[PDB]
Design an enzyme around this catalytic site. Structure first.
Site, short mmCIF file in Angstrom:
data_model
loop_
_atom_site.label_atom_id
_atom_site.label_comp_id
_atom_site.label_asym_id
_atom_site.label_seq_id
_atom_site.Cartn_x
_atom_site.Cartn_y
_atom_site.Cartn_z
N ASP A 100 0.97 -1.29 0.09
CA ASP A 100 -0.15 -0.03 0.04
C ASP A 100 1.11 1.39 -0.07
OD1 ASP A 100 -2.34 1.58 0.21
OD2 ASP A 100 -2.64 0.82 1.93
N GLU A 115 1.34 -10.47 5.80
CA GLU A 115 0.24 -10.86 4.56
C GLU A 115 0.87 -11.75 3.49
OE1 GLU A 115 -2.11 -7.77 3.66
OE2 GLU A 115 -2.90 -7.39 5.96
N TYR A 175 -9.85 -6.94 9.16
CA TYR A 175 -10.77 -5.65 8.80
C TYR A 175 -12.20 -5.97 8.83
CZ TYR A 175 -6.44 -3.15 7.89
OH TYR A 175 -5.30 -2.68 8.16
N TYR A 185 -13.11 -3.88 5.32
CA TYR A 185 -13.35 -4.49 3.99
C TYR A 185 -14.40 -5.76 4.02
CZ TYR A 185 -8.89 -2.11 3.18
OH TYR A 185 -7.84 -1.24 2.98
N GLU A 220 -3.37 -5.41 12.60
CA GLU A 220 -4.06 -4.52 11.95
C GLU A 220 -5.44 -4.71 12.00
OE1 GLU A 220 -3.03 -4.01 7.89
OE2 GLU A 220 -0.76 -4.49 8.35
#
Lengths: 574, 585
Positions: free
Chosen positions: A164, A395, A451, A455, A489
């Protein structure tokens, strides 16, 4: 390693001189610099601050977005007294890869943009004269080095990250020229054992010679508390003052090389007597459970990019303390060494992360790069009391036996490099389902990026999100792995000033509600032992339709001011 | 149609009374209203403004996001003098579908949330008494009515609308509601069509009434002076030295339609109309026998708090902003607007592309978010098309029908589907004016089967936003020219209008150099698009997406709605607004 990772110091035996300032700089779109004598000086440079990322100074797109080869140059006067010392250029980092030249001679090359680059210029250095350093740097992204991505050719190159964060590059950390004695302390390692009110500091020392070594430990006042002889030994500390979470105490280790009745070299560094271990589902610091509270961060600030500055460190730590945090992860790359030094001072816990983000036969070469970065990170950072864990990925794919064999090698390498054998982990994306993941057994504790509510089933579906979250955590619970889980996260993009009643995704109010829901889930599982929110602050990303001037999952704005949700963390972590 | 679409008026023969105000309102999540007798009055109502969308008043998510059945109620006093009249409830719209009750009796039902609903209450109305109206409304989305979407059922039974379109699912009673009274024999419909004969003009007309008595048609000029008169339900009005309705220079005649029985007048309907012709000739759009280049925007019915609620204030501000940009045209993306918008366009000389709510027919977003539903969808689509055209045909502002926005168009099945829609549109439009639809990029020139149905082609393109945005904008321009070169090589000899192009742009987000989402990037993107537009002779219009920031479903790609507005939602200009102003001047 063919060089020392030790932070440079200044004393009777070691010298250092900063090369920070305005350097010369030139883009090399046609890749003709090395064909055209640029290593002897750039033909048409502009000025470029060091340390800094180069991108955000310019007012034109093609310079900001430049991808490819580009060059730095500076000159420095070398004191005559440095004659016949081992003279090194030390770059905090060179992003992403580069070749160092000095006085027209190629010295060394390095791959990996977030760890020190050492270049031995002993044989080409000119004491008592002006010297020249030229660096050829490249910032392209590929699948054989970290962090991974691609390079698109429009002949103009464009970086296409698999991650990102914005592809900042250049000389983002301070640069030194240093002088060491011909026989020097190259490396050392400390490990701790607690014995009632006393402590043992176990150590190893590596030098570049065969002369005797003496090791001393001084307290915070500079008083001698322990002394021993040998490159390997134990320092016995009576009534040890332990380094504690948010309550640091730092001793000073002093390593001497001696030749009869004289000293040949002397290295000193502040260290903290502390132990970390995973016991069942608990994270123990000095034998007592600690619950991790904090953030993933970035090296990211307006204009400077990833450029290091102590002012950013100071503001960030004051903000961190104000939220009652005790921990941060160095997402997604090792930070400037100064961040760890300060964490040591402030008693913060760090999860130190190698840039294994954005994860063909290229894989064997990638593995070599990944292991090399891991070796360098651990050798650089192992003696910081703040560093209590290594994160060896963020990830990646983890659900094939192929991925398993890859990470088995990484973890094995990390284990050989860390004298302390402290906890190793990695951050798992949601696709690493509990029924499919092959790699979580490699970890001392498990880190999850989730998330649920952003998401997955965000907004009007947030109640569904919570059930889905509980469903996954119930699946983890059923495995009875008997290990701690830390969320590394979770967050929502949140535009400062966007208010809505009722809340909407992207509003400040939704960020609060999202966090409250996540906390309810966290607190429902005994084995969850840490929460590191994404992100401490809004940060720059690749531009695109999903990014409104970077990533806005910050709890703070990019200029380090609190959104509404910052108070939520503050109250909870108190 | 079994009712009149004619806008209500007040005169010796026709009466109207507004029902706008605070109505009673109740959600019906358990769907128990009808079996519980709610048509006789809601048991535990809250107050709800009409006209308005209901969603944005509330402070809790579940009320804002409510999906399913919900009910409105009000009461009104009917003047005794309305007895022996035909008495109708007229809803500007009921979104999306509903059943109208009056005095506890079921009157009518309607499917389609953006066109008038007429309910004949003559047989249950009580003149000289208080009467009751109760409306059962539903706002779910499906694949057999417009606009298309799905309904998701959460585990606890709660429904959630899942649109296949990018506008918030606002619903309720979003337009004005009247109760009206008509003569027993009334003007039900009429149509005008124009022919220019030098300095003179012909107004061809048809009149439909609910009876057999003779009809007289008069035309008055803007001063009320008689300029033409004839007799019969079909005929021609001859206008000497006609003052044509011109772009941004309107002139409106008043048509007067009388039903007589010799003794006297039985009914009299009046409406302002504008003498103007629209045709396509080669790659040109001809207004009154001269090429016009369309300049403007797609809009929405969207405003803070009111949602799609109609307000003349919004019309006035929006038209002042439109005129300030030197625009001459807008598209009613993506549904017919309240009639008042067209009335005002007539006055201000604006051109309208009138669009039926045929949006959300994209296979990709359907799948992301069929043999048996498509035939039912076609029926709904054709019905909405008939209602739109019957309602709007006599506005001089309406120069074209848009019959779809971004459907699948690359199969023979899609061709047969749209062939029926276009055929229907043609039969309902007395003027046979230009028909079109807006195509998504997936409708490649090599694959699309439907563009030959159009009189001119509307393209939605986001080269520089969804395709090769930001650092790749140079590549975006190459890709754009590549496509337009392919269109060019087809030599279709029809006009092309760009009906969408734009960038999400956060007001106050400045960057040098620009980034996607910044005000500066919006400017640069537009400049690049103009360069491409201006490279092709057959491009004859540009309607930017969007006039103003507007509400959408929330999600990770929408930062408080859609920010491709050139104006903010409260109607203030971003930096790019001046770019349009300067170009369109």
């Amino acid at each position: 390693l063919e060089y020392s990772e030790l932070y440079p110091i200044q004393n009777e035996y070691r010298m250092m001189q900063s090369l920070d300032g305005m350097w010369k700089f030139q883009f090399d779109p046609e890749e003709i610099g090395k064909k055209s004598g640029w290593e002897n000086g750039l033909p048409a440079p502009v000025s470029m601050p060091v340390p800094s990322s180069f991108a955000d100074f310019f007012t034109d797109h093609k310079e900001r977005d430049y991808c490819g080869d580009f060059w730095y140059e500076t000159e420095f006067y070398l004191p005559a007294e440095w004659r016949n010392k081992k003279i090194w250029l030390r770059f905090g980092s060179i992003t992403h890869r580069g070749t160092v030249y000095c006085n027209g001679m190629e010295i060394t090359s390095h791959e990996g943009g977030f760890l020190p680059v050492l270049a031995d210029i002993s044989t080409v250095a000119k004491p008592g004269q002006v010297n020249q350093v030229v660096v050829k740097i490249n910032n392209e992204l590929n699948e054989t080095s970290l962090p991974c991505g691609a390079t698109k050719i429009l002949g103009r190159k464009l970086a296409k990250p698999y991650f990102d964060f914005f592809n900042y590059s250049g000389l983002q950390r301070s640069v030194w020229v240093i002088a060491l004695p011909e026989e020097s302390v190259k490396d050392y390692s400390v490990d701790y054992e607690l014995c009632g009110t006393d402590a043992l500091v176990k150590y190893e020392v590596v030098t570049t010679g065969e002369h005797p070594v003496i090791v001393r430990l001084l307290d915070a006042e500079g008083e001698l508390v322990a002394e021993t002889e040998g490159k390997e030994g134990i320092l016995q500390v009576a009534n040890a003052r332990l380094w504690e979470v948010r309550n640091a105490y730092l001793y000073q280790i002093v390593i001497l090389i001696t030749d009869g009745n004289g000293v040949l070299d002397e290295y000193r560094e502040k260290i903290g007597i502390r132990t970390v271990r995973i016991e069942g589902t608990k994270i123990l610091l000095n034998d007592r459970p600690v619950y991790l509270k904090g953030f993933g961060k970035h090296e990211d600030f307006p204009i400077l990019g990833r450029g290091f500055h102590w002012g950013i460190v100071k503001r960030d730590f004051e903000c961190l303390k104000w939220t009652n945090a005790n921990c941060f992860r160095t997402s997604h790359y090792p930070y400037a060494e100064e961040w760890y030094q300060f964490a040591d001072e402030e008693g913060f816990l760090i999860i130190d992360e190698v840039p294994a983000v954005g994860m063909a036969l290229t894989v064997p070469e990638l593995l070599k790069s990944h292991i090399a970065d891991t070796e360098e990170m651990i050798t650089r950072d192992k003696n910081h009391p703040s560093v209590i864990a290594w994160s060896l990925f963020n990830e990646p794919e983890t659900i094939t036996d192929y991925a398993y064999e890859y990470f088995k090698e990484v973890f094995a390498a990390a284990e050989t490099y860390d004298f302390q054998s402290r906890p190793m982990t990695g951050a798992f994306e949601k696709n690493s389902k509990p029924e499919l993941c092959k790699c979580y057994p490699l970890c001392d504790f498990i880190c999850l990026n989730r998330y649920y509510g952003w998401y997955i089933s965000g907004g009007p579906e947030i109640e569904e999100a919570e059930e889905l979250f509980r469903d996954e955590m119930d699946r983890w619970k059923a495995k009875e792995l008997n290990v701690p889980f830390v969320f590394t996260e979770f967050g929502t993009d949140t535009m400062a000033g966007l208010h809505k009643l009722p809340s909407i995704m992207w509003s400040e109010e939704y960020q609060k509600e999202y966090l409250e829901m996540n906390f309810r889930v966290f607190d429902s599982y005994e084995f969850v032992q840490g929460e590191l929110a994404w992100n401490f602050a809004d940060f720059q990303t690749t531009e695109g339709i999903m990014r409104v001037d970077g990533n806005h999952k910050g709890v703070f704005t990019r200029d380090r001011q609190p959104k509404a949700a910052a108070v939520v963390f503050k109250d909870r972590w108190e």
